[PDB]
């Protein structure tokens, strides 16, 4: 039996599935620890590993990219879970090594790979605590090329009056996604700051794990996965919307929650987003 993790319903994905909007022919790069392509509830279209020691992007050593991938696009069938965009074309972009880290250069390599291979949506369920002009150039170039660029806001919680949003989440060109729970309360770990754009489910998120497994993870990574999947649903109904139109559709149709510094625009509503972009007109 297939379970639809609550987060998928909480963002109103199923209303769009019933209308025939499932992310078909939308290319989503999961820029992360890779994706297990042997998983019965995931169909991996392609991808690349930018990790020196790790030539296979379909070998997920961190059990992270696979979980992100399953929130984006777990298949609609009689097993496992269900993705926000279950028909999306899923790309494994491995930029995190088995040791648990990656260089920004490997992230930029993934971003450049994603532009060159015509990804519609980049999800970066990862980040670091400091900026680089190079990383900003790279996400700015992705946005200039018409890619919808989604990143996890970071898991740094509150730090007095300061933005704790990670990079590349912090860059204006990137959609920075924070984490709420099933009550639409901000998760205590969710990074805060004026760079926060939207919230999505980020606590106790059931998804696919390597070796035909499922499990719950928490983090702004899980939240970003919902938003990247949401972007794919939107583009499967409005394929000519610009990345700016897709971003505005999500930001301008949210369920308003608390202060913008903690919740940005609030919880995404992909059903409302898919009606209209609300960019200018």
């Amino acid at each position: 039996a297939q379970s639809v993790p609550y987060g998928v319903s909480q963002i109103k994905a199923p209303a769009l599935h019933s209308q025939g909007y499932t992310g078909s022919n939308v290319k989503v790069a999961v820029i992360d620890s890779g994706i297990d392509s042997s998983h019965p509830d995931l169909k991996v279209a392609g991808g690349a590993s930018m990790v020196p020691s790790e030539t296979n992007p379909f070998q997920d050593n961190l059990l992270h990219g696979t979980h992100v991938a399953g929130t984006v696009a777990a298949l609609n069938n009689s097993i496992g879970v269900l993705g926000v965009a279950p028909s999306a074309s899923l790309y494994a972009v491995k930029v995190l090594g088995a040791d648990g880290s990656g260089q920004y250069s490997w992230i930029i390599n993934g971003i450049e790979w994603a532009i060159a291979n015509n990804m519609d949506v980049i999800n970066m369920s990862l980040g670091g605590p400091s900026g680089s002009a190079a990383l900003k150039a790279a996400v700015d170039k992705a946005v200039a090329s018409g890619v919808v660029v989604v990143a996890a806001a970071g898991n740094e919680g509150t730090s007095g009056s300061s933005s704790t949003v990670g990079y590349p989440g912090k860059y204006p060109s990137v959609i920075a996604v924070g984490a709420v729970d099933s009550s639409n309360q901000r998760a205590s770990f969710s990074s805060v700051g004026p760079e926060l754009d939207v919230m999505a489910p980020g606590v106790s998120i059931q998804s696919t794990l390597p070796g035909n497994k499922y499990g719950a993870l928490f983090g702004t990574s899980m939240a970003s996965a919902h938003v990247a999947g949401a972007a794919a649903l939107i583009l499967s109904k409005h394929p000519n919307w610009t990345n700016t139109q897709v971003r505005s559709s999500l930001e301008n149709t949210t369920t308003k929650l608390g202060d913008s510094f903690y919740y940005g625009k609030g919880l995404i509503n992909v059903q409302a987003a898919a009606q209209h972009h609300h960019h200018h007109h």
């Binding site: 995190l96 880290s101 990862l126 990574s221």
Partner: peptide, 4 residues
Amino acid sequence: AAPF
């Protein structure tokens, strides 16, 4: 970077 690291996973978020």
